[PDB]
Curated annotation (Swiss-Prot), chain A:
Official protein name in the record: U3 small nucleolar RNA-associated protein 6
Keyword annotations: Nucleus, Repeat, Ribonucleoprotein, Ribosome biogenesis, rRNA processing
Function: Component of the SSU processome, a pre-ribosomal particle required for the maturation of the 18S rRNA from the 35S pre-rRNA precursor.
InterPro entries linked to this entry: HAT (IPR003107), TPR-like_helical_dom_sf (IPR011990), Utp6 (IPR013949), UTP6_N (IPR055347)
Species classification: Eukaryota, Fungi, Dikarya, Ascomycota, Saccharomycotina
A single GO BP: maturation of SSU-rRNA
Assigned protein family: Belongs to the UTP6 family.
MF terms (GO), sorted A to Z: identical protein binding; snoRNA binding; U3 snoRNA binding
Further comment: Present with 7520 molecules/cell in log phase SD medium.
GO cellular component, one term: Pwp2p-containing subcomplex of 90S preribosome
UniProtKB/Swiss-Prot annotation, chain B:
Protein name (Swiss-Prot/TrEMBL): U3 small nucleolar RNA-associated protein 14
Full-protein positions shown: 301 to 408 of 899
Main function: Involved in nucleolar processing of pre-18S ribosomal RNA.
Top-level taxonomic group: Eukaryota
Subunit structure of this chain's protein: Interacts with snoRNA U3. Interacts with MPP10. Component of the ribosomal small subunit (SSU) processome composed of at least 40 protein subunits and snoRNA U3.
Family recorded in the similarity comment: Belongs to the UTP14 family.
Gene that produces this protein: UTP14
Miscellaneous field: Present with 1470 molecules/cell in log phase SD medium.
Location in the cell: Nucleus, Nucleolus
From Swiss-Prot, chain C:
Organism field: Saccharomyces cerevisiae (strain ATCC 204508 / S288c)
Keywords annotated in UniProt: Nucleus, Repeat, Ribonucleoprotein, Ribosome biogenesis, rRNA processing, WD repeat
Extra information: Present with 5800 molecules/cell in log phase SD medium.
Comp. bias intervals (Basic and acidic residues): 1-8
Pfam annotation, one family: BING4CT
Function noted in UniProt: Involved in nucleolar processing of pre-18S ribosomal RNA.
Protein name: U3 small nucleolar RNA-associated protein 7
Chief place where the protein resides: nucleus
Transmembrane segments: none
Swiss-Prot record, chain E:
Protein name: Protein SOF1
SMART domains found in the cross-reference section: WD40
Record-linked PROSITE patterns: WD_REPEATS_2, WD_REPEATS_REGION
Subcellular location, record wording: Nucleus, Nucleolus
Keywords per UniProt: Nucleus, Repeat, Ribonucleoprotein, Ribosome biogenesis, rRNA processing, WD repeat
Origin species: Saccharomyces cerevisiae (strain ATCC 204508 / S288c)
Gene3D superfamilies: YVTN repeat-like/Quinoprotein amine dehydrogenase (2.130.10.10)
UniProt GO molecular function: mRNA binding
Family to which this protein belongs: Belongs to the WD repeat DCAF13/WDSOF1 family.
Chief place where the protein resides: nucleus
Organism domain of life: Eukaryota
Length: 377, 103, 482, 166, 461
RNA sequence: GGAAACUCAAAGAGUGCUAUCGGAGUGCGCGAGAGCAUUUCCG
């Protein structure tokens, strides 16, 4: 057998564990017969990850009990012997064996990764890189793997070159999820904000705009459009004019539903040239794709683009007198678009009136003005 | 070398240093050229303004009353916004300094 | 700490010095890494301790030990009391699973006992002396009236034996698949139960065999005659391999420890002897026992048991080399340097017929007139069996696997000397300094052959004469050289 | 020298590390070429180390067309760039047991440090992994192979015929 | 009073479910395992009987063989399954031994082919394209040494220059070659030994002692710049290309046919000559043949070391091949078949398990070296059983009955009768030597390891 | 004579089941360790 071999390999830790008096022979034979039964259950014919989990629970609890009897009997923390790292070495062996014998359960993979991230003070990040790279190899599709240990590599070690490297590798591996693109934009903005805060810390002790996020936004837009189209039309390129045009309208709808989420959790981020990259988004959504949709379908979408382009300024201030001061720009563009629209003019009027109602003295008189007087007086 | 080759007890025949290379991790770009169009565009943006540890060491080569309690948020901000290679070199240099001043 | 149990009992050439250092270092490392297994041994043995001075260990009987013992062992403590056939007799199997009982009238029953699975009962109408299993539940031999029979596992009479003119002492040598018979005529014969061949017919020449035991460690057979001679035999030499003078008169019982080191022997002159075997030293005698103990057996831990007919007396740790562990019968004068009976049981009026320790549990089976009784004894069973040879949790598949493996590893019958470590040596022609040759018309054909033979004889004589030649007063001094 | 193997499957691309090696000189013997048939010895010889499924149906058809003309594509190049180590020039260059000599030069053109190989050893190793099929993949998928290959076959046939569906 | 009794408890011994495996509890006591030595002895005897039951050494032919018996075989050294055979009517062939077929054939010369070897020949005006085509070169007795490419599908990197890359031509004939495995140099033998490299049509150097022909050569396997040769002055010569000169010369009692270096010692070689024993020399003290393998009946036509560095394959002029170990000096075991005659070239393969023998009937047969170890990858308990009972046979090989089972073969009747009469002749001549030594006084105890040397230039240092 | 297989035993075939000192530093090897080994922070 090999169960005899694993049990015989775990004997010197109990040897010095009885040689130092913190475990007598009766209870160490008790834990050894319990580990014998657990290990045969582990190396059965058709075992289970539940068996791996509860054997790991047994080893962690006997490690906690060994530390407790060490701080109670010998009154020292580290016994500088074989008795200390042996249980963590065995837990590492059990997690490696479980990830070899059962590689499809991310609950067990995540328990291994959390245990190793906790024991990073004793065994450093090379084992983290090894088991995470083999996890990436065995599951390239599941984007939460890339997102999780990119968060690890950014929040525990903060190595931005390798972080952007694994985001670009995962984005090459599956450029048809929205979540990976959007959280790559989120990480890229976190890096650019930390860099500008480094520059501000330099200025405190006394070029690099959002073009990275805008280029990956553009590649996000065209690639998610193409792969949404290929998620539809499964095997045969559907060939009739109205069906092709209506599916182009459908992917325009889904793509703009992604772009508005970009605008949402960028407006939550802003702290930067926010109007610059928001106007880059809206210049792209002025220069449309497959249909040039301003006079074509989705006129409510065209109204929402006009509404964002008008209300670009108003979304930032609690001191609304500055909004009234610069509102000549907003109402000037508003008149420039009311002069172009007719019933979308009416819906845009209701939208701008609701925005000013959500908003609410010399400028409130001179530079609607009824609400400006009602908020000034 | 043939004499101690006939005193050893078991001879495992990969004798010389064999091909033992670590696998291509996802953290390291292999052939050091942009493959995809995204790598193309991001590197043709980041050709100009990158913190390739020079500005990191220049802006992190700073860190007493400030050591005790006066800069209790400024030192936290500096050690937080320190990057990876700058933080590793700072840890090694401070550990060597404490090894010199505390033996 | 335990390496005495696991122990197995200056040169010129440099490579041979290094090789000798490698092999005795490997010996030391393998003995240590074998001795470090009893940490992983599954359970611990049992004991009853006095824990006081008034609480003697032999004022404890079956009622209180069966009260404070486990339910499974208490239900193992059987009593298969049968009365319509005669004074019964026990033989457990090699592993502790099956039991084989034998009445002196006609009864032979081979049966599980921890399960109620009577798998071969057979009555007969002739006096069945003793019985024993062969290798398994499958085949069991009974020493009947005047022909030994062997039987299949359900009860079909497999074989009468044409030899074994009678039989009253019969058992098995397990690894060799040997059946050993000693009878009331002066014989001892070996019959292999695999090939079916007889192996040897050793004429005993010492009267009828009064008792017999088997050594497990080297598979020699220990006869005990009416001369008081304990002889040890094996089918190499037709003579007895050694002899011993154990008791005076006849010896009624003899029993060997499973490690082959110790021999208990009880005669008919109210005498017991304890013997070493590997040194043949009479270790200590025991006199003054009231009746001649008819049957002694010995546990797997050193806990021997006399059986004096009504009494059964178990002594713990009465096989050391000291003069303290001499088994006595009563603490007199305030003497804690004796060895009292570790425990004892007294049956009513029925003479105990034979003992036998259950192999891997804590109980001593004893068979008497009215049947069977097992006795719960805490230290008298080896706790931790080794599953590659004996196994009380068999199945059909692994039982057949052990059958085919042991039939493939049948040791040949010549290989049982007095010491079975002696098949690796050189053959008594050692030459520790080895001389390796470096440091020293049909009448007419017959007549010419005789001529060439006589010339070879003359050349041999001349070479030996030359070898002996190479390896070897005044007036007569003047009158020399003539 | 066969230490990585590439298998293509109608749910996704698989790459197998070759743990130990096959007997090269006796590779026509009965007692060697029954080991490919039985399962208890093939997983001694080949383990799964990467399996990336193309998930789009049309992207599966496009990968199948690019393989069927013998050309690299995005997902294949992606998983080889991930899995294949940079064997540095001091040691060797890495080897890769692919199924066809038409595909061979098109990966040697793109990756320099790889070296494709298809002798009869790669042929019957790929034959063994094709025979054992799903039982190698140990559950890293959602969907069996035969219905997916039925759909992919019908699509590849219609894309070859350019059959008018009007 | 405190009592206790052992508790089987029936759960840590028999399982809870059905599918999990039952316990094998374990006690390593020499009490409970009584007969140690007799039981492992009987396991050794069953090991010997099962080895004789599985002693099935022959694995196959390859192709339909050549025309008229081989006379040169060259294994390659980089790859495993590629092997060149040159045979008598000028026919060289380059076999892929995996499918056991030939890549290409060539009518290589007119007369007898004499020797071939493969090279990875680094040209200077060309990259070594040695991962798509493989190069072998062959010398015959019609004064030509041809160097050839071979198209080979070992890889699949590319997509044509099939044969006869070039032809070196010599003054006299040629008798053998071998290629220096570094820097594209190769040496030949003929009237006198020559050293070429593949950028010249003329010989770069000439390296004889005197005007005496040279039957065979061999380079090293490491410390490559020295080499050895054998000429029909019954002589072993060594040479060193670093000094570019011959360096020592011994003369034995009969002509050395085939020499072979050791690929793990780098200063030991075996030497196969017409007296029926392969000598095994140490280089830096050529006064004593530090072993002599002494079991044939006829001329020892070829030898080679296995690349594991301890086994010798030999093939005799009588129709038999033998495998020796280095450390013994007698035959481990012997192959033969009825359909092979006069094995002329034997070579270990680089796998160190398969010996390629080439007869004079035409075939290039193959054999397993260990005649019972199969080639499949085995499960770990089976590998444990095989290595354990092989170690038992190795430990108990001196017992007489398993010696008389492990020793005997079916040696063919010709070899058995002729070895029997050779043995009675040797016993008779030893008896007459004992009589003569019984008389005389100045008679040296002549060592068997120095019996065959009858002269050494650079006598002693 | 038909057989309930749920009493049990001995066996025969077919099917499915597994692998082979601790983190750094320090003399170190071609962004880099797979190891040689410590008084350097040490634990």
């Amino acid at each position: 057998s090999k169960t005899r071999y694993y049990l015989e390999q775990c004997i010197p830790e109990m040897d010095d564990l009885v040689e130092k008096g913190l475990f007598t022979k009766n209870e160490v034979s008790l834990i050894m017969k319990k580990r014998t039964d657990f290990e045969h259950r582990l190396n059965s014919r058709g075992s289970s990850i539940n068996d791996y989990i509860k054997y790991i629970n047994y080893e962690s609890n006997v490690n906690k009990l060994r530390a407790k009897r060490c701080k109670r009997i010998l009154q020292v923390k580290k016994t500088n012997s074989l008795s200390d790292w042996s249980i963590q070495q065995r837990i590492g062996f059990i997690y490696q064996r479980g990830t070899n014998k059962f590689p499809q359960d991310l609950k067990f993979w995540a328990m291994y990764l959390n245990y190793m991230k906790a024991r990073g003070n004793q065994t450093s990040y090379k084992k983290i890189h090894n088991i995470y790279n083999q996890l990436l190899k065995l599951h390239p599709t599941n984007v939460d793997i890339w997102i999780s240990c990119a968060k690890y590599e950014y929040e525990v070690h903060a190595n931005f070159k390798s972080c952007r490297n694994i985001f670009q590798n995962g984005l090459r591996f599956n450029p048809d999820v929205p979540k990976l693109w959007y959280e790559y934009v989120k990480f890229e903005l976190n890096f650019i904000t930390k860099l500008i805060n480094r520059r501000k810390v330099m200025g405190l002790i006394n070029a690099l705009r959002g073009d990275i996020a805008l280029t990956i936004f553009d590649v996000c837009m065209k690639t998610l459009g193409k792969h949404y189209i290929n998620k539809h039309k499964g095997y045969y390129a559907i060939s009739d004019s109205k069906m092709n045009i209506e599916l182009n309208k459908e992917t325009l709808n889904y793509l703009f539903s992604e772009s508005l989420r970009y605008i949402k959790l960028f407006d939550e981020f802003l702290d930067l040239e926010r109007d610059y990259l928001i106007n880059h988004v809206l210049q792209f959504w002025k220069n449309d794709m497959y249909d040039l949709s301003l006079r074509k379908d989705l006129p409510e979408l065209y109204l929402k683009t006009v509404m964002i382009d008008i209300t670009l300024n108003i979304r930032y201030m609690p001191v609304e007198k500055l909004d009234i001061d610069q509102l000549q720009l907003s109402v000037k563009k508003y008149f420039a678009y009311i002069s172009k629209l007719d019933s979308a003019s009416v819906k845009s009027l209701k939208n701008e009136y609701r925005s000013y109602l959500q908003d609410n003295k010399m400028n409130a008189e001179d530079d609607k003005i009824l609400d400006l007087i009602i908020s000034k007086l | 070398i043939v004499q101690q080759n006939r005193r050893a007890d078991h001879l495992i025949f990969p004798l010389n240093k064999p091909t033992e290379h670590n696998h291509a991790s996802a953290f390291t770009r292999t052939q050091d050229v942009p493959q995809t169009e995204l790598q193309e565009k991001v590197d043709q943006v980041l050709q100009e303004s990158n913190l390739a540890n020079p500005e990191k060491d220049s802006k992190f080569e700073e860190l007493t009353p400030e050591e005790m309690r006066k800069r209790t948020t400024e030192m936290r901000l500096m050690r937080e916004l320190m990057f990876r290679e700058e933080r590793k070199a700072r840890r090694l240099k401070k550990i060597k300094s404490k090894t010199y001043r505390k033996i | 700490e335990n390496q005495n149990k696991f122990e197995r009992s200056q040169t010129k050439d440099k490579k041979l010095r290094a090789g000798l250092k490698k092999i005795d270092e490997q010996y030391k490392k393998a003995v240590s890494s074998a001795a470090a297994t009893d940490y992983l041994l599954p359970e611990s043995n049992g004991y009853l301790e006095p824990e006081n001075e008034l609480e003697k260990t032999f004022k404890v009987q079956q009622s209180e030990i069966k009260s404070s013992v486990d339910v499974s062992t208490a239900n193992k403590a059987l009593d298969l009391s049968l009365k319509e056939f005669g004074p019964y007799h026990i033989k457990y199997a090699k592993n502790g699973t099956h039991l084989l009982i034998t009445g002196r009238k006609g009864h032979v029953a081979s049966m599980d006992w921890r399960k109620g699975q009577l798998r071969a009962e057979l009555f007969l109408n002739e006096t069945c002396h003793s019985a024993t299993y062969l290798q398994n539940e499958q085949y069991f031999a009974v020493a009947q009236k005047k022909y030994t029979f062997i039987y299949d596992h359900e009860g079909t009479e497999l074989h009468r034996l044409k030899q074994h003119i009678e039989a009253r002492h019969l058992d098995f040598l397990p690894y060799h698949y040997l059946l050993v018979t000693a009878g009331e005529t002066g014989w001892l014969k070996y019959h292999d139960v695999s090939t079916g061949q007889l192996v040897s017919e050793l004429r005993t020449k010492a009267g009828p065999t009064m008792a017999m035991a088997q050594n497990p460690w080297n598979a020699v057979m220990h006869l005990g005659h009416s001369n008081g001679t304990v002889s040890l035999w094996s089918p190499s030499m037709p003579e007895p391999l050694v002899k011993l003078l154990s008791a005076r008169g006849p010896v009624n019982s003899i029993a060997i420890d499973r490690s082959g080191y110790y021999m208990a022997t009880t005669g008919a002159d109210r005498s017991m002897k304890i013997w070493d075997i590997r040194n043949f030293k009479q270790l200590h005698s025991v006199e003054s026992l009231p009746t001649p103990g008819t049957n002694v057996s010995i546990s797997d831990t050193g806990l021997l048991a006399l059986s004096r007919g009504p009494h059964v007396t178990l002594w713990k740790d009465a096989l050391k080399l000291s003069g303290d562990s001499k088994p006595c019968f009563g603490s007199m004068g305030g003497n804690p340097h004796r060895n009292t009976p570790y425990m004892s049981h007294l049956f009513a009026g029925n003479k105990v017929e034979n003992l036998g320790f259950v192999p891997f549990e804590d109980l001593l089976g004893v068979g008497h007139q009215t049947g069977i009784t097992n006795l719960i004894v805490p230290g008298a069973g080896e706790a931790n069996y080794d599953a590659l040879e004996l196994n009380p949790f068999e199945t059909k598949k692994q039982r057949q696997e052990q059958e085919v493996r042991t039939l493939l590893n049948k040791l040949p019958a010549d290989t049982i000397t007095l010491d079975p470590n002696s098949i690796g040596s050189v053959d008594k022609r050692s030459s520790t300094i080895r001389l390796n040759a470096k440091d020293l018309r049909s009448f007419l054909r017959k007549k010419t052959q005789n001529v060439i033979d006589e010339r070879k004889l003359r050349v041999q004589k001349q070479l030996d004469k030359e070898k002996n030649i190479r390896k070897r007063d005044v007036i007569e001094e003047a009158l020399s050289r003539f | 020298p066969i230490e990585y193997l590439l298998f293509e499957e109608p749910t996704g691309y698989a790459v197998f590390k070759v743990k130990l090696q096959q007997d090269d000189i006796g590779s026509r013997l009965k007692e060697v070429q029954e080991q490919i048939n039985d399962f208890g010895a093939f997983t001694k010889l080949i383990e799964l180390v990467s399996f990336a499924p193309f998930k789009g149906a049309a992207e599966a058809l496009e990968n199948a067309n690019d393989i069927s003309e013998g050309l690299v594509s995005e997902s294949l190049k992606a998983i080889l760039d991930l899995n294949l180590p940079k064997a540095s020039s001091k040691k060797k260059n890495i080897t890769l047991a692919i199924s066809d000599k038409n595909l061979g030069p098109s990966i040697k053109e793109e990756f320099p440090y790889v070296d494709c190989i298809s002798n009869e050893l790669a042929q019957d190793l790929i034959r063994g992994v094709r025979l054992h099929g799903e039982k190698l993949f140990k559950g890293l998928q959602s969907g069996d192979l035969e219905r997916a290959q039925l759909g992919l076959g019908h699509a590849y046939s219609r894309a070859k015929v350019k059959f008018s569906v009007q | 009073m405190k009592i206790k009794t052992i508790k089987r408890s029936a759960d840590d011994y028999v399982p809870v479910k059905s599918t999990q495996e039952s316990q094998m509890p374990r006690n390593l006591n020499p009490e409970l395992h009584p007969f140690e030595r007799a039981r492992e002895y009987t396991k050794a005897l069953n090991a010997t009987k099962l080895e004789r039951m599985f002693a099935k050494p022959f694995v196959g032919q390859l192709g339909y063989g050549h025309r008229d018996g081989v006379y040169a075989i060259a294994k390659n050294y980089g790859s495993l399954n590629k092997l060149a055979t040159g045979s008598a009517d000028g026919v060289i062939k380059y076999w892929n031994m995996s499918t056991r077929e030939e890549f290409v054939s060539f009518k290589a010369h007119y007369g007898l082919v004499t020797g071939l070897c493969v090279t990875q020949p680094r040209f200077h005006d060309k990259k070594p394209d040695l991962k798509s085509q493989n190069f072998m070169l062959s010398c015959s007795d019609d004064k030509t040494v041809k160097l050839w490419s071979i198209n080979v599908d070992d890889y699949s990197n590319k997509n044509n220059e099939e044969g006869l890359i070039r032809t070196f031509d010599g003054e006299s004939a040629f008798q053998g070659i071998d290629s220096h495995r570094e820097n594209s140099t190769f040496a030949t033998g003929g009237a006198k030994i020559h050293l070429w490299d593949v950028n010249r049509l003329k010989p770069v150097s000439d390296l004889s002692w005197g005007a005496d022909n040279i039957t065979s050569l061999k380079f090293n396997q490491n410390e490559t710049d020295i080499l050895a040769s054998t000429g029909s002055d019954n002589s072993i010569v060594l040479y060193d290309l670093r000094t570019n000169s011959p360096t020592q010369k011994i003369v034995q009692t009969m002509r050395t046919n085939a020499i072979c270096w050791n690929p793990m010692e780098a200063f030991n070689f075996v030497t196969a000559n017409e007296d029926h024993n392969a000598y095994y020399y140490d280089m830096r003290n050529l006064s004593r043949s530090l072993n002599v393998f002494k079991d044939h009946v006829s001329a020892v036509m070829d030898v080679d070391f296995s690349p594991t560095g301890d086994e010798i394959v030999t093939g005799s002029y009588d129709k038999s091949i033998r495998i020796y170990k280095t450390n013994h000096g007698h035959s481990r075991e012997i192959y033969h078949t009825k359909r092979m005659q006069h094995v002329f070239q034997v070579k270990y393969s680089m796998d160190s398990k398969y010996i390629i023998s080439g007869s004079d009937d035409g075939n290039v047969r193959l054999w397993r070296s260990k005649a019972w170890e199969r080639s499949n990858v085995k499960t770990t308990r089976e590998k444990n059983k095989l290595e354990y009972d092989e170690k038992l046979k190795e430990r108990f090989r001196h017992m007489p009955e398993i010696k008389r089972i492990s020793r005997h073969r079916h040696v063919p009747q010709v070899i058995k009768k002729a070895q029997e009469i050779k043995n009675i002749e040797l016993s008779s001549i030893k008896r007459r030597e004992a009589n003569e030594r019984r008389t005389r006084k100045d008679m040296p105890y002549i060592s068997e390891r120095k019996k065959q040397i009858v002269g050494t230039v650079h006598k002693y240092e």
